[PDB]
Amino acid sequence: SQPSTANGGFPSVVVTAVTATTSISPDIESTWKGLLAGESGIHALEDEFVTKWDLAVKIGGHLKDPVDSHMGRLDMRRMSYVQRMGKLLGGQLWESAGSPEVDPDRFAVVVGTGLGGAERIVESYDLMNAGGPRKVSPLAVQMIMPNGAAAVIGLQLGARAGVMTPVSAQSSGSEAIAHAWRQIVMGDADVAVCGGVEGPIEALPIAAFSMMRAMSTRNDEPERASRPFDKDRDGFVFGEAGALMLIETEEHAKARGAKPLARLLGAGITSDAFHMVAPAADGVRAGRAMTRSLELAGLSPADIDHVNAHGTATPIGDAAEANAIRVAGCDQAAVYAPKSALGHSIGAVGALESVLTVLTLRDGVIPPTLNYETPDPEIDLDVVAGEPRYGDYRYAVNNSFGFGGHNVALAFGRY
Amino acid sequence: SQPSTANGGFPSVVVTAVTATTSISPDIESTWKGLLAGESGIHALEDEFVTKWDLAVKIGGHLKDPVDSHMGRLDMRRMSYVQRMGKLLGGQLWESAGSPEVDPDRFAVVVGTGLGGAERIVESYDLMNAGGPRKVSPLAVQMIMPNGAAAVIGLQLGARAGVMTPVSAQSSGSEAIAHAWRQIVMGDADVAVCGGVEGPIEALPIAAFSMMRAMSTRNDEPERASRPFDKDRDGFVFGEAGALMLIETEEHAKARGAKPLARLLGAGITSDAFHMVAPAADGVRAGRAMTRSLELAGLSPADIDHVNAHGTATPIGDAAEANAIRVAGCDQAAVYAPKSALGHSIGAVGALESVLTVLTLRDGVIPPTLNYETPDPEIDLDVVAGEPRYGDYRYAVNNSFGFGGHNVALAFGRY
Ligand SMILES: C=C/C(C)=C/[C@@]1(C)SC(=O)C(C)=C1O
Ligand SMILES: C=C/C(C)=C/[C@@]1(C)SC(=O)C(C)=C1O
Ligand code: NA
Ligand code: NA
C-alpha cells in the first residue's frame, strides 16, 4: 500500500521557524498582526518613476524595510538583489531557529525565484556594449544564474545535502517547499531551509506584465486595487516580498528542543497543458494538485478546513481557481486570498502564503480578504471577508499557480 | 529497509527514446558514430563578433544544424531560443518514440536550462529604453521565464502530471533527469520527457565566462583545446547542444511495445557548501552524490563499470572530480570525458552526457576521450583514450556539477 503521512509511510515533517519581509513589515509576526487588523501594504508608486515612463500601473507595495539598508559596499558590488535578499532572510531565519548546529550533510536548501539576478544581465550588457568584454565582472555569471540565491543561502548556512532552485514562475516559492519536503521524506535530508525570493518593483517588469493586461490600474485608491474573487477585480497588484521557512523531521525537531509551528503533510504538482499565460478554465489539473497533496498527506477533501488561495485578482485567474477548489472537493473550506493585502511577489509569493497558512493553523484565525465587497456568482466560495474568521483549523491547503501552466498545492496541518 | 530499485522498493524505470542536437550532428545516432570515430565538434569562431569584440576566446562548436533553420516567422516571434530548441527536440523525441498515445495525467516534463530566454530580456530593455513601456511585447514574460522551455514542451506534448525546471547551472540537464526519475518512482507520473536545453555561443556569455579565466584560450588548434584530465588543460570550451530522453516505468514501456535503451536506476543530489564557482578540492560531497545514486539503485561501487565524467578540462575541476570518483570507490571504472569532443553546453550538458551514458550501455562501447596525451600525474583514473573501448558495461554513473556547489549523479543500467 502507498505511503502517506497519516499511515507513517513518510516521516512526519514539521515547520519550526518562519521569516518573511513584506510591504507591511520586515517582521512576520507584525505582518500577521497587521493583516488581522485589516491593513494593506499597497500604496501609490512614487512618482517621477511613473512619469519617466508614463506607466499605466501607478501602484504597488515596496518592502517596508528595504533589503539594501542592511547591505554593505562589498555585498552591493558582489551579489545580485535576490542574493542580498536571500542572505538577509537566511540569517534571520537561522537566528529565529536558535542558530542550531545541524549535520551539514543532512541539511538542504530549496529556494525558488521567477528570474534571478536579471539586473546584472542588463548591467553587463550595457558595460560590454560601451567598453568591451573586459568591462564585464568576473562575478557576473554567479550573480545572474537563477540558482544564485539558493546557493548563497546554502553557502551561508552550510547546507551539504543539496541546494535546489525550482523555477515555475508564480508558483516557484511553493514549489521550493514541495521539493524540500520530497527531499526529507525520500531520506536525502532531515532538515531544509525553503521558500522564495524575488526582485523589487521596477519599470521593465511593470511594463512586461502590464502589456499582458494582467495588472490592476485602479490607481486612485491603491489599497482598494487588489480585489481577488471580487466581481470588480481588474488584475494583480505587485507587492514586494521574500519568505523562508525551516522544515525538519519531527524527530529532528524533538532532539534539539524546537517547538513546531505546523506540520507539512504533503505536496502535489501537476500541469495544465492548456496555455502559456492563461489557466485552464475548468480547473481540473489545478484541483488534482490539491487532491495529490491530500493523497500524500493521508487526508480527504472533507478534512480541509481552510484554503489559502493563489487568488491574483485577474478575471480568468480567480475563476479557474474557484473551479479548481470545487474539483478538489474543497469548496466548503474557508478561503483567504492574501494578495488582497500583500500583493503579488511572483517567485516569492507561494513561500509567503505558505508561512501565512502556517500562522493560520498555529493561531486558529484567518485574516479578512481585503476589498471583497461584491460576490461573483461564478466564484461560489466561502471567502473570508470583513473581520477575521476564528476557528479550529486543523488542515489547510496552500495553492500556487504559475505561467507555463504550473499547479502546486501544499497540505499543512496544525501541530 | 529503505526502498531501492534492486529490492523492488522503487518501480523499474527505463529509457525508451533519446534525442540530441550537437556540434557534430543534428541526429544523436550520427553524433554517436562521430564520437566513436574520434571526431571533434570544436572549430574556429567565424562569427564576426570575434574581431568585433576581440574576444580572448576564438573557438567553440556551433550546432552542425542550427535550430532556427527549422523555425518559421511565428516561432521566431513567440519563442525565445531555448523554447525553439525545446520544441524542436520535443517533437523529434516524440516521433522517435513512435508518437505514443499516453495518459496526459500521468505524463510529466522536466527540462533544465542555465538561464532562460535572456536574449528577450535585453531585447525588451532596449525596446523600452527607445520607445517606452508599450514597445514591450505581451509575449515577453513567457519567453523570458526560465521555465519557458519546459512549459513549451509540456504544452506541445500534452503533459499534465507536472512540468519542472530545476536550475543548477552546469548540472541542470542531469538534475532534470534526477527529478523526472523522482516523479515516476514517487508515483506522480508513469512517463516523462526530461533533459536540458541551452542558448547558442554568443559574445556576452564568452565575455562573462572568459573574465572568470575558466575557458581555454588554445586558439590555434580548436580540436585540441578541450583536454579533460590532461596535464596541459587550460579550461573549458563551449560546444552547443540540447538533449532530451523519454523515461517510463518498465510496465508502461512493455504495454506499448517500447524497447528500452537502458535502465535509470537511481539519482543523488548533494551540495559542497564550499564556493560559488569552485568545487571542493576533497571531492567528498560530489562523491556522496555518486554514492547516493548507488544506494537508491541498490548497487555497490564494484558494480560501476563506467563513469561518464563532468570533465570540464579546468585544472581544479578535473582534480576535484578525480577525488570524488575515488571517494565514491569508483576509481577502477572506465572513464569518459565527452566535453573533450563536444565541449560544454552548460545547462544542456548533463542531459547530453546522460544520453551518451545510455548509449554506452546499449552498445557496450565508450568513445575515446580526445586530447588525452599526457596523463596528469596527480590524476590516476582509467580514462578511455586513443580508440573506443568495447567492454561489458553493466552499470554506469553519469556525473554533473554546477556553479553554486551542485553535485548530481545518475546511476544507469544496461537493459
Ligand atoms: C497558466 C497561467 C496561470 C497559472 C496564470 C495565473 C493565474 S498564475 C499568476 O500568478 C498569474 C498572474 C496568472 O495569470
Ligand atoms: C562549484 C563549482 C563547480 C562545480 C565548478 C565546475 C567544476 S562545474 C562546471 O561546469 C565548471 C565549468 C566548473 O568550473
Ligand atoms: Na496561496
Ligand atoms: Na558527465
UniProtKB/Swiss-Prot annotation, chains A, B:
Q: Which GO terms describe its cellular component?
A: cytosol
Q: For substrate, which residues are the binding ones? A: 310, 344
Q: Which controlled-vocabulary keywords does the entry list?
A: Acyltransferase, Cytoplasm, Fatty acid biosynthesis, Fatty acid metabolism, Lipid biosynthesis, Lipid metabolism, Transferase
Q: In which pathway does it act?
A: Lipid metabolism; mycolic acid biosynthesis
Database matches in NCBIfam families: PRK07314.1, PRK07910.1
The taxonomic lineage of its organism, from the top, reads: Bacteria, Bacillati, Actinomycetota, Actinomycetes, Mycobacteriales
Highest taxon of source: Bacteria
Q: Which reaction does it catalyse?
A: an ultra-long-chain mono-unsaturated fatty acyl-[ACP] + malonyl-[ACP] + H(+) = a 3-oxo-ultra-long-chain mono-unsaturated fatty acyl-[ACP] + holo-[ACP] + CO2
A Pfam family that the UniProt record links to this protein: Ketoacyl-synt_C
According to its UniProt record, where is this protein located? Cytoplasm
Q: Which GO terms describe its biological process?
A: fatty acid biosynthetic process
Q: Which residues form the Ketosynthase family 3 (KS3) domain?
A: 10-414
Q: What is this protein called?
A: 3-oxoacyl-[acyl-carrier-protein] synthase 1
Q: Which family does the entry's similarity section mention?
A: Belongs to the thiolase-like superfamily. Beta-ketoacyl-ACP synthases family.
In this protein, the active site sits at 170, 310, 344
Q: Does the keyword Lipid biosynthesis apply?
A: yes
The source organism is Mycobacterium tuberculosis (strain CDC 1551 / Oshkosh)
EC annotation from Swiss-Prot or TrEMBL: 2.3.1.293
Tell me the function of this protein: Part of the mycobacterial fatty acid elongation system FAS-II, which is involved in mycolic acid biosynthesis. Catalyzes the elongation of long chain acyl-ACP substrates by the addition of two carbons from malonyl-ACP to an acyl acceptor. Involved in the initial extension of the mycolate chain and forms monounsaturated fatty acids that averaged 40 carbons in length.
